[PDB]
Structure formats: structure tokens, C-alpha cells
Amino acid sequence: MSSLLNSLLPEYFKPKTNLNINSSRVQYGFNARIDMQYEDDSGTRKGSRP
């Protein structure tokens, strides 16, 4: 059933037809922007991985 397996894919994922696989290992994932924060009695230390 193509229909039920299609709904499992994420909303942001827009797939194309061809995929040129040339190896026996693939790292599928996503890139996200994490805005980390460390608060303490002394003060706050902010970080950001884009």
C-alpha cells in the first residue's frame, strides 16, 4: 500500500524521483538550529549551533 507508507514521511520532506545510491551505507537525517542556554546564580551563558 503506497498510500499508508507515504503518510509516514515528514511534512518538510519534499522527495524527487531519482536517487543515485553508490554505496552500502546511507546516513539519512535533518539539519536543525539548536538555541541552548545555561542559567545559574552567577549569570547566563548562551550558545547556538546553526
Add this chain to the structure above:
Amino acid sequence: MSSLLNSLLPEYFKPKTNLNINSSRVQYGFNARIDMQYEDDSGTRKGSRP
């Protein structure tokens, strides 16, 4: 004039009669609590001298 020289003294200063001076040098002043702060894009670093 005792009156005009009396008004120059601070409000918190409550003087007593006797002062036992035993040297040719005196460091008059006051003790205060300073709450310092350093803010920056990275974060805030707070200090306190009581």
C-alpha cells in the same frame, strides 16, 4: 557656627562624644554593598561585594 557645619554631615552618620585618636593619619569613609553586572551577546556575569 556649629549649626551650618552640623548640616554638612551625612544622614546615616550618628556621631558619639569621645574619639580616641592615637595617630597622625585617619581613613574616614563608609561601607556600601555594590551589585555589579556585565551583560553581553554570549550571556550575563553577576558579582556582589557586600
